[PDB]
Amino acid sequence: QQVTLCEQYGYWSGNGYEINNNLWGRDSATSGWQCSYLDGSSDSGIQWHTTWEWQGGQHDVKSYVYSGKQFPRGQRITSINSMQTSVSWYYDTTNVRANVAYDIFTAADPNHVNSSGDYELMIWLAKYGDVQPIGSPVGTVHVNGRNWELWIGMNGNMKVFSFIAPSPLNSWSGEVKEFFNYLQYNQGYPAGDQHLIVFQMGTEAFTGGPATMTVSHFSANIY
Numbered sequence: 001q002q003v004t005l006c007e008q009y010g011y012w013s014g015n016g017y018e019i020n021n022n023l024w025g026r027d028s029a030t031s032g033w034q035c036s037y038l039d040g041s042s043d044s045g046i047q048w049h050t051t052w053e054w055q056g057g058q059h060d061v062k063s064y065v066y067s068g069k070q071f072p073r074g075q076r077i078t079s080i081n082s083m084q085t086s087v088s089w090y091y092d093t094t095n096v097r098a099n100v101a102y103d104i105f106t107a108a109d110p111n112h113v114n115s116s117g118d119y120e121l122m123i124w125l126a127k128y129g130d131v132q133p134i135g136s137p138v139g140t141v142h143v144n145g146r147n148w149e150l151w152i153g154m155n156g157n158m159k160v161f162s163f164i165a166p167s168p169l170n171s172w173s174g175e176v177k178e179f180f181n182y183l184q185y186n187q188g189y190p191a192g193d194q195h196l197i198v199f200q201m202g203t204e205a206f207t208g209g210p211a212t213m214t215v216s217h218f219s220a221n222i223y
């Protein structure tokens, strides 16, 4: 690929996008490895893939390698008109324990560290193996023209909302404001007090492989 990132927290930046070989939970594994590969980038989005094998620590995420959209700090969720995103992705195998998910952090502190937030909003486009979101399911919700199983729970002091697609969504053009709006008016999410911290798409890897997730296209448009 045009660039290869194998070390933990390996990093690429370009065209207002970034990729992080974010192997944050790798110490939970008895064995394994993972790289992220930039296939191409332009202002209109990027193309990348990641290959990994992880064994051991069955219930612990080893990594969340991601492509992130860059944006200025200090954007209040209620000031954002649109958080549109498009992604096309596919795994080269069914038999992994992993998901494919957008990860979004918000915090009242606009300078919050990018590794967490006051709140976390996940959109799980797919779920492989028996992997489960944070918390417990609260029912099926209609957001952005689709149905999702909404899970809610706490990761430490961070409240986590995970919207789970009922079947894998290998290609998706979404309006992430819809999910924030849903949460603001149905789950008491204080959107007017929160700032966008990160906006990422990637895969949480638990166990399995060697497996490859290919992102044919990833773009986001925040305005």
Ligand SMILES: OC[C@H]1O[C@@H](OC[C@H]2O[C@@H](O)[C@@H](O)[C@@H](O)[C@@H]2O)[C@@H](O)[C@@H](O)[C@@H]1O
Pocket: 009, 020, 022, 024, 064, 103, 114, 115, 116
């Ligand atoms: O500081 C090293 C890198 O931190 C990374 O964030 C870590 C954070 O990742 C989330 O996905 C979540 O699963 C947390 O459990 C975990 O701590 C990363 O974003 C980079 O910005 C840093 O290079």
